[PDB]
């Protein structure tokens, strides 16, 4: 236990470095905390509140993506409080989410859909009318249908930190807080399809890939890119002998989680 602290996930002991978050300790144990706004290569935002978990001998659930474990914490992940918190947060997301799933590019690729089936309720009590947000025109690559946006600020954080353009942000307040650009500006830089990758909902989709196929149809062939000398690892998504899509692969020594616009 040299420069390490002992914590517990469901009573199972594990050594962690100081500064390790609850989510990181949980995935060290081998369980994946639900998330929408946390990305391991973006900065910590902590807004979507999907990662609320119950610590033993603690009354309030904590955000696993942001809270660092202190010492001896027993992270109850499948507890009643954690399940209730996940159900409530999923209910609040799907209250104003639009019924766009058949006409959406996130067919089987939707974190909102998958985490709904895995952690949320199976029905809704929302008897009111939903909101609608007009779409933007940020370029010929990223198609925006911003009614589907859940305001997780992943695109804003990516553009601020990795693309380094500072062009996206949240304008407004409350339920009317809109992600995008205030002016008619084109989000046209290199490394700009990675917002299509990291947007969990279908708010930011690919315009060449629009309405073409579905992820269950697409076969995944793991290949290397030749458009530059980086040699970024990619997945070619192919359906019926046709190249449909280019996605990145995780490789921490070459391209991490992203690929350029040329190869995408």
């Amino acid at each position: 236990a040299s420069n390490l602290i002992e914590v517990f996930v469901d009573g199972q002991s594990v050594m962690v470095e100081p500064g390790t978050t609850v989510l990181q300790a949980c995935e060290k144990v081998g369980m994946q905390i639900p998330r929408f706004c946390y990305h391991e290569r973006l900065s910590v935002a902590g807004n979507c509140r999907m990662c609320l978990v119950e610590i033993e001998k603690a009354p309030k659930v904590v955000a696993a993506c942001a809270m660092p474990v202190m010492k001896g914490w027993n992270i109850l992940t499948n507890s009643e409080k954690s399940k209730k918190a996940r159900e409530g947060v999923m209910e609040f997301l799907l209250a104003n989410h639009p019924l766009d799933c058949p006409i959406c590019d996130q067919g089987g690729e939707c974190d909102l859909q998958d985490q709904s089936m895995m952690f949320g309720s199976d029905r809704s009590r929302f008897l009111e009318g939903k909101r609608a947000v007009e779409d933007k025109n940020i370029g010929p690559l990223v198609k925006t249908i911003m009614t589907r946006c859940i305001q997780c600020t992943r695109c804003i954080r990516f553009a601020s930190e990795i693309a380094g353009v500072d062009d996206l942000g949240t304008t407004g307040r409350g339920n009317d807080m809109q992600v995008g650009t205030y002016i008619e500006k084109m989000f046209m830089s290199e490394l700009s399809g990675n917002v299509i990758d990291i947007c969990p909902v279908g708010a930011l989709t690919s315009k060449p890939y629009a309405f073409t196929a579905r992820p269950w149809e697409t076969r995944k062939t793991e290949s290397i890119d030749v458009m530059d000398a980086v040699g970024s690892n990619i997945v070619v998504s192919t359906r019926t002998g046709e190249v449909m899509r280019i996605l990145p692969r995780m490789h921490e020594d070459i391209n991490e989680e992203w690929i350029s616009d040329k190869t995408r």
């Binding site: 509140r49 609320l52 947060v89 609040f92």
Partner: protein, 430 residues
């Protein structure tokens, strides 16, 4: 003591609450401000921290957190960074005007408290984040700070005590969420008024990434009088663990809505019928009271009969003492309309950063509008209760809790009124 109330004017701290005397430097000096503050600063940070701890002053913001402990979180050696004191002069909570009154009428009290607290934690500067609508109050505060700077109380020698302190005033631009601690810190930092998560706490990473302490105007302004008159006197006022003197802002259906300075643990009936002139129509006409601003829930007349003005007493009454804003509603009040107006205020003032507050407070506003119209069924009351419980405790800051609490209080107390409205609507529409 057992019975609390009937405070003496010789014991009242805010001696010029009502604006009848001069608010300038000469008026503050005649009223007793800036007296022996050089001796206080030479006594130093540990003595002031012990004085506030033994005074037992709690946060006037509404959090209720012990001021001595909160200020003692910053009693650390410097790590190469400056340390800051920030004054929450927002005061966006409804029903509340006490911060505005003491800023515009005793601003030198606020400046002296800024100096004393900044010395208490160890600090170079106090940023006063004032509400942007309080333009006259902000200019008044700046005139007082100019008088202090010219008198040498602040700047390069803090009252001749070999201490460098600077008091700045920064104005908001109209956001109730900018009254929050971390959101106020972000607003000073120049971003939007969105609160940041804790940890890191402001005592470690705060404004500009420096250790800082955010404190209420009332807390800061009563700090130097606490230091001058001792913590024993302030602890003697009020009950155990709810000690001292509070500014109560009585508004609504009362004969004389007013801001008054009164001892803690005063009965609510005694306070209303002594200072407000009583409820319009009488105590029998009184229906409900929201006793701590809009974030605290409501209490009916039956428990209003014998309730005190403590944090602990209102928690036992299933409420809280927030900004000590006593909103009184008589029998003529549309109680569901008042609560729905409060929820509409929370919808307009939510910052929208985090999903439970954003979506749930909008949902609660829509359901409360339908409740006012009577356009729902009694199962939706339990549905709204569950929605409020999902909002409460799952949010980033306490605006979600402060918006879920009035709905909880209305459902807890005035449920037959809601059922009567729904039944009347169902009868007259079918």
């Amino acid at each position: 003591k057992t019975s609390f109330g009937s405070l003496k004017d010789e014991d009242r701290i805010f001696t010029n609450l009502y604006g009848r005397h001069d608010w300038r430097l000469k008026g503050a000096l005649r009223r007793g401000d800036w007296y022996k503050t050089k001796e206080i600063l030479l006594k130093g940070p540990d003595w002031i921290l012990g004085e506030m701890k033994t005074s037992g002053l709690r946060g006037r913001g509404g959090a209720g957190f012990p001021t001595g402990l909160k200020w003692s979180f910053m009693n650390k050696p410097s790590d190469g960074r400056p340390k800051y004191l920030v004054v929450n002069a927002d005061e966006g909570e409804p029903g509340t005007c006490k911060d505005r009154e003491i800023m515009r009428h005793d601003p030198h009290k606020l400046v002296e408290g800024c100096l004393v607290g900044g010395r208490a934690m160890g600090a170079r500067a106090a940023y006063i984040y004032i509400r942007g609508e309080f333009y006259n109050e902000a200019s008044n505060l700046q005139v007082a700070i100019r008088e202090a700077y010219e008198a040498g109380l602040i700047g390069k020698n803090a009252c001749g005590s070999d201490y460098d302190f600077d008091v700045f005033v920064v104005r908001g631009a109209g956001a109730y969420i900018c009254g929050e601690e971390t959101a106020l810190i972000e607003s000073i930092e120049g971003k939007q008024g969105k609160p940041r998560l804790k940890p890191p706490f402001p005592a470690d990473v705060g404004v500009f990434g420096c250790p800082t302490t955010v404190a209420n105007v009332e807390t800061v302004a009563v700090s130097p009088t606490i230091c001058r008159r001792g913590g024993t006197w302030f602890a003697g006022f009020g009950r155990e663990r709810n000690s001292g003197t509070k500014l109560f802002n009585i508004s609504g259906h009362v004969n004389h809505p007013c801001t008054v300075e009164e001892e803690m643990s005063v009965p609510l009936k005694e306070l209303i019928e002594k200072h407000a002139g009583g409820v319009t129509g009488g105590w029998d006409n009184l229906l409900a009271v929201i006793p701590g601003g809009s974030s605290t829930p409501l209490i009916p007349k039956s428990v209003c009969e014998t309730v005190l003005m403590d944090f602990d007493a209102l928690v036992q009454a299933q409420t809280g003492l927030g900004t000590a804003a006593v909103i009184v509603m008589d029998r003529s009040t549309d109680i569901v309309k008042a609560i729905a107006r409060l929820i509409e205020f929370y919808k307009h003032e939510s910052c929208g950063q985090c999903t439970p507050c954003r979506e749930g407070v909008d949902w609660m506003n829509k359901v409360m509008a339908r409740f006012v119209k009577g356009d729902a069924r009694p199962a939706e009351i339990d549905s709204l209760w569950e929605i409020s419980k999902q909002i409460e405790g799952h949010t980033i800051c306490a605006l979600g809790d402060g918006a879920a609490w009035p709905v909880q209080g209305l459902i807890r107390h005035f449920r037959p009124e809601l059922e009567d409205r729904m039944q009347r609507f169902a009868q007259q529409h079918r």
